[PDB]
Enzyme design. Sequence first.
Site, short mmCIF file in Angstrom:
data_model
loop_
_atom_site.label_atom_id
_atom_site.label_comp_id
_atom_site.label_asym_id
_atom_site.label_seq_id
_atom_site.Cartn_x
_atom_site.Cartn_y
_atom_site.Cartn_z
N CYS A 1 -135.81 -43.87 59.60
CA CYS A 1 -135.17 -43.71 60.93
C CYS A 1 -134.26 -44.88 61.28
O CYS A 1 -134.56 -46.04 61.00
CB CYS A 1 -136.26 -43.58 61.96
SG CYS A 1 -137.65 -42.70 61.30
N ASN A 74 -136.18 -48.73 62.16
CA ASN A 74 -137.47 -48.93 62.79
C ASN A 74 -138.35 -49.64 61.76
O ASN A 74 -137.94 -49.83 60.60
CB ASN A 74 -138.07 -47.59 63.19
CG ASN A 74 -137.99 -46.56 62.08
OD1 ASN A 74 -137.42 -46.81 61.02
ND2 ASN A 74 -138.56 -45.39 62.33
N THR A 76 -140.91 -48.64 60.12
CA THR A 76 -141.40 -47.84 59.00
C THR A 76 -140.34 -47.14 58.18
O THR A 76 -140.64 -46.16 57.49
CB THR A 76 -142.43 -46.81 59.45
OG1 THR A 76 -141.79 -45.77 60.20
CG2 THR A 76 -143.49 -47.47 60.30
N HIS A 77 -139.10 -47.62 58.26
CA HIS A 77 -138.05 -46.98 57.48
C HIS A 77 -138.13 -47.47 56.05
O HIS A 77 -138.34 -48.66 55.81
CB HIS A 77 -136.67 -47.28 58.03
CG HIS A 77 -135.60 -46.60 57.26
ND1 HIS A 77 -135.41 -46.82 55.92
CD2 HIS A 77 -134.76 -45.60 57.60
CE1 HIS A 77 -134.50 -45.99 55.46
NE2 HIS A 77 -134.09 -45.23 56.46
N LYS A 295 -97.72 -52.01 59.26
CA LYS A 295 -98.18 -51.37 58.04
C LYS A 295 -99.67 -51.08 58.19
O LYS A 295 -100.28 -51.43 59.21
CB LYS A 295 -97.87 -52.29 56.86
CG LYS A 295 -96.34 -52.54 56.74
CD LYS A 295 -95.90 -53.57 55.67
CE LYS A 295 -95.77 -52.97 54.27
NZ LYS A 295 -95.49 -54.04 53.28
N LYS A 397 -100.51 -59.11 35.53
CA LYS A 397 -101.52 -58.23 36.10
C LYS A 397 -102.06 -57.19 35.13
O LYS A 397 -103.27 -57.07 34.95
CB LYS A 397 -100.95 -57.54 37.33
CG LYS A 397 -100.30 -58.52 38.30
CD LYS A 397 -100.03 -57.86 39.63
CE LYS A 397 -99.44 -58.83 40.62
NZ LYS A 397 -98.01 -59.15 40.38
N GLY A 427 -133.48 -40.51 63.34
CA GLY A 427 -133.58 -40.40 61.91
C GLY A 427 -133.31 -38.98 61.51
O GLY A 427 -133.41 -38.07 62.32
N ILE A 428 -132.95 -38.76 60.27
CA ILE A 428 -132.69 -37.42 59.84
C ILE A 428 -133.52 -37.20 58.59
O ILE A 428 -133.88 -38.16 57.91
CB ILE A 428 -131.18 -37.22 59.61
CG1 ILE A 428 -130.72 -38.02 58.40
CG2 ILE A 428 -130.42 -37.71 60.81
CD1 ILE A 428 -130.83 -37.26 57.14
N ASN A 448 -134.17 -41.56 53.92
CA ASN A 448 -134.30 -41.00 55.27
C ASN A 448 -135.59 -41.42 55.96
O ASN A 448 -136.42 -42.06 55.27
CB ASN A 448 -134.26 -39.48 55.22
CG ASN A 448 -135.28 -38.91 54.28
OD1 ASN A 448 -136.27 -39.56 53.94
ND2 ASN A 448 -135.06 -37.68 53.85
#
Length: 448
Positions: A1, A74, A76-77, A295, A397, A427-428, A448
């Site tokens: 999460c 969090n 616990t991630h 630019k 180069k 979280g997902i 996740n």
Amino acid sequence: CFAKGTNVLMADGSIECIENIEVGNKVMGKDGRPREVIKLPRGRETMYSVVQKSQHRAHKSSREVPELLKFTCNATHELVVRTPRSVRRLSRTIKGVEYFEVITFEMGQKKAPDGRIVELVKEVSKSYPISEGPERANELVESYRKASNKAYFEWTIEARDLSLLGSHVRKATYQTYAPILYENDHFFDYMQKSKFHLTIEGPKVLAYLLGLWIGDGLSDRATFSVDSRDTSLMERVTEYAEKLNLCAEYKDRKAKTVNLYSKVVRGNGIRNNLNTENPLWDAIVGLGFLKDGVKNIPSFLSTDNIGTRETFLAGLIDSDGYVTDEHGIKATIKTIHTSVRDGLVSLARSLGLVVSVNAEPAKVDMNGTKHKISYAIYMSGGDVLLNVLSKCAGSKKFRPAPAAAFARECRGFYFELQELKEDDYYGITLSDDSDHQFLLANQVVVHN
DNA sequence: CTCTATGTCGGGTGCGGAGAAAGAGGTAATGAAATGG
DNA sequence: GCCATTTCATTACCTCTTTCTCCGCACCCGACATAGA
């Protein structure tokens, strides 16, 4: 999460805020392929902060803070981490007797104060007195070195468990980011989408030219400078310019300045055209290489066709690009425009190259001139970078193309971990059969 | 006559490169305290 | 508790990059004039 704010990389390569990602959308998998979402776990918990480490130091003015990779989860991630496999031998003495030691990194377990059973990496040692003879020791050392193919472990650990790691292991532990392997073709479709209709060298040459322009080009004309001395480059210019069906108006008259003129009407006399009927220009503006007067390296380029991503840098590097090879292939573009800096870094990485910028404050001196905030963006990456160089024209180069099918492996990064105050978290969740990890937007690989 | 694209001019400053310092992790080498029998 | 390893953070270096920095002048950019349109 994840903590609210954290940007995610969507499968279409766009960037969506975590809090706004719904169910059914498709995030980016490290393989470049889509990772469907099926759950939006939300809630409140203790949050932790991440932030890459680095040789950086200038502080403690508002000298911008580095672009260091970071995010917040969090407690616990699960942190997708990596740790080298290491085995050192050692000879010490205690209680009189001296023995042989075999220090090694091996994945064990350890009890979290909270009682949990956590699988992690531990420093293990086995020893017997010198009396027996270095034979037993020397055996394991290979019986390890020759234990598993990867030189590092690839495991996961929750932020909150990180402390559990011993000193040596902790320091030797990093997280990683992966290259933007996905591929749009916006560049290509655009090209096809216009009046001009060139050969199949367009996307290439055009890409290469946009690269040079950005570097040594002029911001109000489809024309640019060159080193009257690098001849190889000189030709490339003509050639590519010619293929887009335009002219190279070389003029070194007291270094060299060229202009890419259309073969159109000249006007009444000779007062040729350069901006008119010119794909170069038609694009610089079309694709956004010239946003609001200054630019700029357009972001869509980070997620487009690799070949093209390559070629473009090729150009950038052929002008405003210093290359060396002594202790590894490495290349350095210098700029003063934010957009250029940014845009380049985001692109640089998309490939798998390792990038690091270094700002240089404004100044004012004896000549009494007001210098400006400067940026020395630094790159490297063995093959990945080489394969770019292989597409260069400049003498100093250019560099041969990598063997072949060089892997675009992830790059790891050492970080810092910080305990933050409890807070809502978003979280997902991805479908089962996948790897369960998706890429964030700053290319950092997370679970996740 | 007005509104844009092309040359073209003069001034103050971008950047070119390299060498070196200042971090960052890896190594031994320690001092000792915890584990298991 | 005697024995016989193990576990572990800290210490002093040790190797390897990658951050910094230095500085003047040829060149970059804003400014301007003029053929188109």
